Amino acid sequence: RGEVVGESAEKSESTATFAPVTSLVRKVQVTQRFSQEVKWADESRQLGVLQT
Amino acid sequence: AVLKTSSFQLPRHLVPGVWQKAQGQSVLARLSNAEPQEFGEQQYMTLTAPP
């Protein structure tokens, strides 16, 4: 907070106060399984199903 | 109140490198020379008794 001081009046102290907070960490994954037939079909026909 | 670093709960500085006790090396590799060998059991021929 600010303080209003007259000429030659005593100046106080008012200070910021703090506290710390910590995160957690998460690992997230998606695994999708398909035949190599699905790969050769997609890739030769250019369907874009693996891109999808 | 004056601000002190306890209010920050500062994390430690993890320094690079690992300190290790020494390990004893092979004695046989210094005391006996490696002969060049092909893969599989070698056979050596020995005198058993003299004439």
Tab-separated table of N, CA, C and O in Angstrom:
chain	number	residue	atom	x	y	z
A	1	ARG	N	0.836	-1.214	0.000
A	1	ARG	CA	0.000	0.000	0.000
A	1	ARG	C	0.867	1.259	0.000
A	1	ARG	O	1.929	1.278	0.619
A	2	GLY	N	0.432	2.318	-0.667
A	2	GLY	CA	1.077	3.633	-0.583
A	2	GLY	C	0.839	4.328	0.761
A	2	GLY	O	-0.116	4.012	1.465
A	3	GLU	N	1.671	5.301	1.120
A	3	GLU	CA	1.505	6.145	2.308
A	3	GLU	C	1.659	7.626	1.952
A	3	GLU	O	2.553	7.984	1.193
A	4	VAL	N	0.800	8.488	2.499
A	4	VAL	CA	0.868	9.953	2.363
A	4	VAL	C	1.677	10.519	3.523
A	4	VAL	O	1.213	10.508	4.659
A	5	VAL	N	2.876	11.024	3.245
A	5	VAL	CA	3.788	11.599	4.240
A	5	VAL	C	3.933	13.107	4.070
A	5	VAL	O	4.248	13.591	2.987
A	6	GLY	N	3.712	13.863	5.143
A	6	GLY	CA	4.037	15.288	5.193
A	6	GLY	C	5.538	15.548	5.128
A	6	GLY	O	6.349	14.635	5.246
A	7	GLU	N	5.938	16.801	4.963
A	7	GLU	CA	7.355	17.158	4.995
A	7	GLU	C	7.967	16.801	6.354
A	7	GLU	O	7.438	17.174	7.399
A	8	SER	N	9.080	16.069	6.347
A	8	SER	CA	9.763	15.546	7.536
A	8	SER	C	8.942	14.580	8.415
A	8	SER	O	9.339	14.292	9.542
A	9	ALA	N	7.822	14.039	7.940
A	9	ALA	CA	7.130	12.947	8.616
A	9	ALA	C	7.851	11.612	8.378
A	9	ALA	O	8.505	11.421	7.354
A	10	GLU	N	7.737	10.665	9.306
A	10	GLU	CA	8.386	9.356	9.191
A	10	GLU	C	7.697	8.463	8.153
A	10	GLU	O	6.489	8.247	8.208
A	11	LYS	N	8.471	7.901	7.225
A	11	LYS	CA	8.025	6.961	6.194
A	11	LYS	C	8.003	5.535	6.738
A	11	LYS	O	8.998	5.083	7.286
A	12	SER	N	6.901	4.816	6.580
A	12	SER	CA	6.757	3.412	6.987
A	12	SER	C	7.308	2.436	5.942
A	12	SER	O	7.800	2.841	4.892
A	13	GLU	N	7.164	1.135	6.190
A	13	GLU	CA	7.335	0.084	5.182
A	13	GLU	C	6.058	-0.760	5.013
A	13	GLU	O	5.422	-1.174	5.977
A	14	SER	N	5.681	-1.025	3.764
A	14	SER	CA	4.635	-1.972	3.371
A	14	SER	C	5.160	-2.783	2.199
A	14	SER	O	5.599	-2.219	1.199
A	15	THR	N	5.147	-4.103	2.322
A	15	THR	CA	5.869	-5.019	1.422
A	15	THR	C	4.915	-5.984	0.737
A	15	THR	O	3.907	-6.407	1.301
A	16	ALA	N	5.245	-6.375	-0.491
A	16	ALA	CA	4.613	-7.508	-1.146
A	16	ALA	C	4.841	-8.804	-0.345
A	16	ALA	O	5.923	-9.027	0.189
A	17	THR	N	3.853	-9.693	-0.297
A	17	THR	CA	4.004	-11.059	0.239
A	17	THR	C	3.680	-12.094	-0.835
A	17	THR	O	2.864	-11.845	-1.721
A	18	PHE	N	4.325	-13.258	-0.769
A	18	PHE	CA	4.269	-14.293	-1.804
A	18	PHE	C	4.067	-15.684	-1.219
A	18	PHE	O	4.431	-15.945	-0.075
A	19	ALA	N	3.561	-16.605	-2.034
A	19	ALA	CA	3.551	-18.034	-1.747
A	19	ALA	C	3.793	-18.839	-3.034
A	19	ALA	O	3.367	-18.396	-4.101
A	20	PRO	N	4.461	-20.003	-2.982
A	20	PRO	CA	4.748	-20.812	-4.157
A	20	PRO	C	3.692	-21.905	-4.386
A	20	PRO	O	3.115	-22.431	-3.439
A	21	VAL	N	3.473	-22.305	-5.635
A	21	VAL	CA	2.594	-23.421	-6.025
A	21	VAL	C	3.342	-24.331	-6.997
A	21	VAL	O	4.045	-23.838	-7.870
A	22	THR	N	3.207	-25.649	-6.889
A	22	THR	CA	3.854	-26.624	-7.787
A	22	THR	C	2.854	-27.302	-8.715
A	22	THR	O	1.703	-27.527	-8.358
A	23	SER	N	3.273	-27.608	-9.937
A	23	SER	CA	2.509	-28.396	-10.898
A	23	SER	C	2.601	-29.894	-10.598
A	23	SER	O	3.400	-30.326	-9.775
A	24	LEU	N	1.811	-30.691	-11.313
A	24	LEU	CA	2.104	-32.099	-11.590
A	24	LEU	C	2.530	-32.251	-13.054
A	24	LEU	O	2.545	-31.279	-13.812
A	25	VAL	N	2.875	-33.467	-13.451
A	25	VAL	CA	3.214	-33.845	-14.828
A	25	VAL	C	2.368	-35.032	-15.259
A	25	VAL	O	2.213	-35.974	-14.494
A	26	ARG	N	1.849	-35.028	-16.483
A	26	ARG	CA	1.067	-36.126	-17.061
A	26	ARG	C	1.627	-36.539	-18.407
A	26	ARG	O	1.880	-35.695	-19.250
A	27	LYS	N	1.738	-37.837	-18.635
A	27	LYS	CA	2.067	-38.441	-19.930
A	27	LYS	C	0.776	-38.989	-20.523
A	27	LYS	O	0.089	-39.750	-19.853
A	28	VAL	N	0.454	-38.626	-21.754
A	28	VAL	CA	-0.763	-39.071	-22.433
A	28	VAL	C	-0.391	-39.679	-23.777
A	28	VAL	O	0.455	-39.142	-24.486
A	29	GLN	N	-1.009	-40.799	-24.138
A	29	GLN	CA	-0.716	-41.522	-25.375
A	29	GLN	C	-1.970	-42.088	-26.031
A	29	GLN	O	-2.924	-42.455	-25.362
A	30	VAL	N	-1.942	-42.207	-27.349
A	30	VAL	CA	-2.920	-42.941	-28.153
A	30	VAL	C	-2.145	-43.926	-29.009
A	30	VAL	O	-1.223	-43.524	-29.708
A	31	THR	N	-2.507	-45.203	-28.982
A	31	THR	CA	-1.905	-46.233	-29.839
A	31	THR	C	-2.990	-46.898	-30.668
A	31	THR	O	-3.943	-47.428	-30.113
A	32	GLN	N	-2.869	-46.874	-31.992
A	32	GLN	CA	-3.834	-47.466	-32.918
A	32	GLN	C	-3.170	-48.550	-33.755
A	32	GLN	O	-2.141	-48.299	-34.366
A	33	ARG	N	-3.763	-49.741	-33.799
A	33	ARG	CA	-3.222	-50.956	-34.413
A	33	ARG	C	-3.982	-51.328	-35.688
A	33	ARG	O	-5.203	-51.293	-35.705
A	34	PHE	N	-3.289	-51.681	-36.763
A	34	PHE	CA	-3.879	-52.020	-38.066
A	34	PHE	C	-3.022	-53.051	-38.823
A	34	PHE	O	-1.829	-53.170	-38.573
A	35	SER	N	-3.601	-53.818	-39.745
A	35	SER	CA	-2.841	-54.767	-40.574
A	35	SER	C	-1.942	-54.055	-41.568
A	35	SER	O	-2.236	-52.946	-42.004
A	36	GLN	N	-0.868	-54.702	-42.019
A	36	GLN	CA	-0.113	-54.104	-43.116
A	36	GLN	C	-0.891	-54.084	-44.436
A	36	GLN	O	-0.576	-53.298	-45.316
A	37	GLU	N	-1.972	-54.853	-44.540
A	37	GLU	CA	-2.909	-54.779	-45.653
A	37	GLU	C	-3.603	-53.409	-45.686
A	37	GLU	O	-3.631	-52.764	-46.727
A	38	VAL	N	-4.106	-52.916	-44.548
A	38	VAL	CA	-4.684	-51.582	-44.401
A	38	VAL	C	-3.686	-50.513	-44.820
A	38	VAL	O	-4.060	-49.594	-45.534
A	39	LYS	N	-2.405	-50.644	-44.475
A	39	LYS	CA	-1.379	-49.711	-44.938
A	39	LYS	C	-1.200	-49.742	-46.450
A	39	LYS	O	-1.240	-48.683	-47.066
A	40	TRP	N	-1.026	-50.911	-47.069
A	40	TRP	CA	-0.865	-50.981	-48.524
A	40	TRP	C	-2.097	-50.515	-49.297
A	40	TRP	O	-1.971	-49.839	-50.317
A	41	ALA	N	-3.292	-50.820	-48.801
A	41	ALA	CA	-4.528	-50.309	-49.363
A	41	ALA	C	-4.570	-48.781	-49.303
A	41	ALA	O	-4.642	-48.146	-50.348
A	42	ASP	N	-4.447	-48.178	-48.118
A	42	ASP	CA	-4.454	-46.726	-47.944
A	42	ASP	C	-3.435	-46.042	-48.851
A	42	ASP	O	-3.751	-45.135	-49.609
A	43	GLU	N	-2.200	-46.515	-48.801
A	43	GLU	CA	-1.046	-45.886	-49.415
A	43	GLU	C	-1.063	-45.966	-50.944
A	43	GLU	O	-0.645	-45.025	-51.606
A	44	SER	N	-1.583	-47.042	-51.530
A	44	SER	CA	-1.694	-47.171	-52.990
A	44	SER	C	-2.898	-46.431	-53.559
A	44	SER	O	-2.811	-45.852	-54.639
A	45	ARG	N	-4.018	-46.417	-52.838
A	45	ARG	CA	-5.243	-45.714	-53.235
A	45	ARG	C	-5.258	-44.237	-52.852
A	45	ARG	O	-6.119	-43.500	-53.322
A	46	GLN	N	-4.329	-43.797	-52.009
A	46	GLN	CA	-4.228	-42.436	-51.480
A	46	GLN	C	-5.484	-42.002	-50.717
A	46	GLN	O	-5.926	-40.867	-50.843
A	47	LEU	N	-6.077	-42.888	-49.916
A	47	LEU	CA	-7.298	-42.581	-49.166
A	47	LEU	C	-7.074	-41.594	-48.020
A	47	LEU	O	-7.993	-40.895	-47.628
A	48	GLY	N	-5.880	-41.553	-47.446
A	48	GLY	CA	-5.570	-40.762	-46.267
A	48	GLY	C	-6.194	-41.279	-44.977
A	48	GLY	O	-6.426	-40.484	-44.066
A	49	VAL	N	-6.482	-42.579	-44.855
A	49	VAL	CA	-7.014	-43.095	-43.582
A	49	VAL	C	-5.960	-43.101	-42.483
A	49	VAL	O	-6.288	-42.710	-41.371
A	50	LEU	N	-4.687	-43.399	-42.749
A	50	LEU	CA	-3.671	-43.274	-41.703
A	50	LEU	C	-3.417	-41.811	-41.332
A	50	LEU	O	-3.235	-41.514	-40.157
A	51	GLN	N	-3.494	-40.866	-42.273
A	51	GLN	CA	-3.418	-39.457	-41.913
A	51	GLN	C	-4.605	-39.049	-41.043
A	51	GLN	O	-4.434	-38.385	-40.034
A	52	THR	N	-5.810	-39.498	-41.378
A	52	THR	CA	-6.992	-39.284	-40.539
A	52	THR	C	-6.792	-39.839	-39.130
A	52	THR	O	-7.104	-39.157	-38.167
B	1	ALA	N	6.358	-6.893	7.502
B	1	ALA	CA	7.437	-7.895	7.571
B	1	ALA	C	8.323	-7.850	6.328
B	1	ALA	O	7.829	-7.719	5.212
B	2	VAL	N	9.637	-7.977	6.509
B	2	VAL	CA	10.642	-8.136	5.436
B	2	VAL	C	10.437	-9.441	4.662
B	2	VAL	O	10.091	-10.471	5.236
B	3	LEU	N	10.666	-9.405	3.355
B	3	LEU	CA	10.607	-10.564	2.468
B	3	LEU	C	11.866	-11.437	2.576
B	3	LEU	O	12.977	-10.955	2.367
B	4	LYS	N	11.690	-12.736	2.831
B	4	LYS	CA	12.771	-13.737	2.915
B	4	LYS	C	12.556	-14.885	1.929
B	4	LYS	O	11.422	-15.239	1.606
B	5	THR	N	13.642	-15.496	1.462
B	5	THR	CA	13.629	-16.583	0.464
B	5	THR	C	12.899	-17.849	0.912
B	5	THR	O	12.542	-18.655	0.063
B	6	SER	N	12.587	-18.032	2.198
B	6	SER	CA	11.762	-19.160	2.665
B	6	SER	C	10.364	-19.164	2.034
B	6	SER	O	9.829	-20.211	1.678
B	7	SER	N	9.804	-17.980	1.791
B	7	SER	CA	8.530	-17.785	1.090
B	7	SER	C	8.570	-18.182	-0.390
B	7	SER	O	7.528	-18.306	-1.018
B	8	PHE	N	9.752	-18.393	-0.967
B	8	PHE	CA	9.892	-18.900	-2.327
B	8	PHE	C	10.075	-20.422	-2.384
B	8	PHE	O	9.887	-20.980	-3.446
B	9	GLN	N	10.427	-21.107	-1.291
B	9	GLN	CA	10.745	-22.545	-1.264
B	9	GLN	C	11.626	-22.970	-2.449
B	9	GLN	O	11.228	-23.791	-3.272
B	10	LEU	N	12.802	-22.362	-2.591
B	10	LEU	CA	13.605	-22.513	-3.801
B	10	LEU	C	14.029	-23.970	-4.057
B	10	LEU	O	14.460	-24.648	-3.124
B	11	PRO	N	13.962	-24.469	-5.301
B	11	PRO	CA	14.431	-25.802	-5.649
B	11	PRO	C	15.958	-25.852	-5.740
B	11	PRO	O	16.592	-24.857	-6.075
B	12	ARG	N	16.575	-27.005	-5.473
B	12	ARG	CA	18.041	-27.156	-5.545
B	12	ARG	C	18.587	-27.065	-6.962
B	12	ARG	O	17.894	-27.342	-7.932
B	13	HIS	N	19.861	-26.739	-7.086
B	13	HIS	CA	20.601	-26.794	-8.345
B	13	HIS	C	21.235	-28.171	-8.545
B	13	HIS	O	22.244	-28.492	-7.926
B	14	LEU	N	20.666	-29.002	-9.416
B	14	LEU	CA	21.234	-30.292	-9.791
B	14	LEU	C	22.426	-30.099	-10.724
B	14	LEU	O	22.291	-29.594	-11.830
B	15	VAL	N	23.603	-30.495	-10.269
B	15	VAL	CA	24.880	-30.302	-10.950
B	15	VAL	C	25.180	-31.500	-11.867
B	15	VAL	O	24.989	-32.638	-11.444
B	16	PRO	N	25.650	-31.295	-13.107
B	16	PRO	CA	26.034	-32.377	-14.010
B	16	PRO	C	27.116	-33.322	-13.462
B	16	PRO	O	27.977	-32.912	-12.689
B	17	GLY	N	27.121	-34.570	-13.922
B	17	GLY	CA	28.129	-35.592	-13.610
B	17	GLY	C	27.741	-36.528	-12.466
B	17	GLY	O	26.962	-36.163	-11.591
B	18	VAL	N	28.288	-37.748	-12.470
B	18	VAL	CA	28.034	-38.771	-11.442
B	18	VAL	C	29.331	-39.124	-10.725
B	18	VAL	O	30.286	-39.566	-11.359
B	19	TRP	N	29.366	-38.981	-9.402
B	19	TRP	CA	30.482	-39.437	-8.571
B	19	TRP	C	30.394	-40.938	-8.299
B	19	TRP	O	29.333	-41.438	-7.938
B	20	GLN	N	31.486	-41.672	-8.483
B	20	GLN	CA	31.526	-43.136	-8.436
B	20	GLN	C	32.699	-43.611	-7.583
B	20	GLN	O	33.800	-43.066	-7.684
B	21	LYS	N	32.523	-44.694	-6.828
B	21	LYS	CA	33.650	-45.482	-6.322
B	21	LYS	C	34.376	-46.164	-7.475
B	21	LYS	O	33.748	-46.552	-8.456
B	22	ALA	N	35.687	-46.326	-7.358
B	22	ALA	CA	36.487	-47.065	-8.325
B	22	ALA	C	36.110	-48.552	-8.338
B	22	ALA	O	35.805	-49.143	-7.302
B	23	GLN	N	36.151	-49.168	-9.514
B	23	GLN	CA	35.952	-50.603	-9.708
B	23	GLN	C	37.262	-51.303	-10.066
B	23	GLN	O	38.034	-50.817	-10.894
B	24	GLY	N	37.508	-52.474	-9.482
B	24	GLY	CA	38.655	-53.293	-9.833
B	24	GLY	C	38.513	-53.884	-11.228
B	24	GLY	O	37.521	-54.538	-11.539
B	25	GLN	N	39.504	-53.637	-12.073
B	25	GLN	CA	39.603	-54.161	-13.432
B	25	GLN	C	39.988	-55.645	-13.454
B	25	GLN	O	40.412	-56.205	-12.448
B	26	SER	N	39.918	-56.291	-14.617
B	26	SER	CA	40.415	-57.657	-14.788
B	26	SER	C	41.904	-57.778	-14.478
B	26	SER	O	42.709	-56.971	-14.945
B	27	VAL	N	42.298	-58.789	-13.714
B	27	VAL	CA	43.703	-59.177	-13.588
B	27	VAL	C	44.112	-60.071	-14.742
B	27	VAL	O	45.205	-59.901	-15.271
B	28	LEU	N	43.248	-60.981	-15.186
B	28	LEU	CA	43.604	-61.939	-16.223
B	28	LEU	C	43.930	-61.255	-17.546
B	28	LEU	O	44.851	-61.686	-18.223
B	29	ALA	N	43.271	-60.146	-17.869
B	29	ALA	CA	43.529	-59.395	-19.090
B	29	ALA	C	44.907	-58.718	-19.137
B	29	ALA	O	45.382	-58.378	-20.217
B	30	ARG	N	45.540	-58.500	-17.980
B	30	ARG	CA	46.888	-57.936	-17.844
B	30	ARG	C	47.950	-59.011	-17.681
B	30	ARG	O	49.027	-58.926	-18.260
B	31	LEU	N	47.647	-60.047	-16.912
B	31	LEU	CA	48.585	-61.116	-16.603
B	31	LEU	C	48.745	-62.136	-17.735
B	31	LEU	O	49.836	-62.663	-17.911
B	32	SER	N	47.702	-62.410	-18.520
B	32	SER	CA	47.737	-63.335	-19.662
B	32	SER	C	47.276	-62.644	-20.943
B	32	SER	O	46.212	-62.034	-20.975
B	33	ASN	N	48.059	-62.713	-22.015
B	33	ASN	CA	47.717	-62.061	-23.277
B	33	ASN	C	46.580	-62.785	-24.003
B	33	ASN	O	46.558	-64.013	-24.072
B	34	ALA	N	45.667	-62.034	-24.610
B	34	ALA	CA	44.655	-62.598	-25.488
B	34	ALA	C	45.293	-63.212	-26.739
B	34	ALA	O	45.907	-62.510	-27.540
B	35	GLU	N	45.120	-64.510	-26.951
B	35	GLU	CA	45.417	-65.118	-28.242
B	35	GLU	C	44.264	-64.841	-29.216
B	35	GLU	O	43.104	-64.865	-28.803
B	36	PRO	N	44.518	-64.568	-30.504
B	36	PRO	CA	43.449	-64.474	-31.488
B	36	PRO	C	42.767	-65.838	-31.644
B	36	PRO	O	43.434	-66.843	-31.842
B	37	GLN	N	41.444	-65.887	-31.553
B	37	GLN	CA	40.655	-67.115	-31.631
B	37	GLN	C	39.500	-66.978	-32.614
B	37	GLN	O	38.827	-65.961	-32.651
B	38	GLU	N	39.221	-68.029	-33.371
B	38	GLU	CA	37.968	-68.174	-34.116
B	38	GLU	C	36.857	-68.752	-33.233
B	38	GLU	O	37.133	-69.332	-32.193
B	39	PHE	N	35.592	-68.588	-33.616
B	39	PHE	CA	34.455	-68.982	-32.789
B	39	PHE	C	34.403	-70.497	-32.545
B	39	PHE	O	34.322	-71.268	-33.492
B	40	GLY	N	34.376	-70.931	-31.291
B	40	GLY	CA	34.210	-72.325	-30.889
B	40	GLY	C	35.336	-72.860	-30.009
B	40	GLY	O	36.330	-72.187	-29.749
B	41	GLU	N	35.176	-74.073	-29.489
B	41	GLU	CA	36.150	-74.653	-28.571
B	41	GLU	C	37.499	-74.906	-29.255
B	41	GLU	O	37.607	-75.665	-30.203
B	42	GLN	N	38.556	-74.303	-28.735
B	42	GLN	CA	39.941	-74.604	-29.050
B	42	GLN	C	40.367	-75.913	-28.382
B	42	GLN	O	39.784	-76.325	-27.382
B	43	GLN	N	41.412	-76.545	-28.900
B	43	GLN	CA	42.066	-77.711	-28.321
B	43	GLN	C	43.575	-77.506	-28.305
B	43	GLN	O	44.163	-77.154	-29.320
B	44	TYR	N	44.209	-77.772	-27.173
B	44	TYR	CA	45.642	-77.643	-26.950
B	44	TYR	C	46.223	-79.014	-26.616
B	44	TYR	O	45.606	-79.794	-25.896
B	45	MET	N	47.418	-79.320	-27.102
B	45	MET	CA	48.052	-80.629	-26.941
B	45	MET	C	49.139	-80.604	-25.870
B	45	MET	O	49.987	-79.721	-25.877
B	46	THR	N	49.138	-81.557	-24.941
B	46	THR	CA	49.997	-81.506	-23.751
B	46	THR	C	50.769	-82.794	-23.525
B	46	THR	O	50.198	-83.877	-23.634
B	47	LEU	N	52.046	-82.697	-23.156
B	47	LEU	CA	52.817	-83.836	-22.671
B	47	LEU	C	52.305	-84.258	-21.299
B	47	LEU	O	52.213	-83.447	-20.386
B	48	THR	N	51.987	-85.534	-21.141
B	48	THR	CA	51.455	-86.106	-19.899
B	48	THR	C	52.542	-86.760	-19.057
B	48	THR	O	52.582	-86.555	-17.853
B	49	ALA	N	53.448	-87.509	-19.675
B	49	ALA	CA	54.618	-88.080	-19.018
B	49	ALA	C	55.777	-88.257	-20.004
B	49	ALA	O	55.541	-88.665	-21.139
B	50	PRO	N	57.028	-87.990	-19.603
B	50	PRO	CA	58.189	-88.130	-20.471
B	50	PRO	C	58.729	-89.576	-20.548
B	50	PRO	O	58.495	-90.376	-19.645
B	51	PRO	N	59.500	-89.917	-21.593
B	51	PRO	CA	60.239	-91.168	-21.680
B	51	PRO	C	61.359	-91.239	-20.636
B	51	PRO	O	61.938	-90.215	-20.284
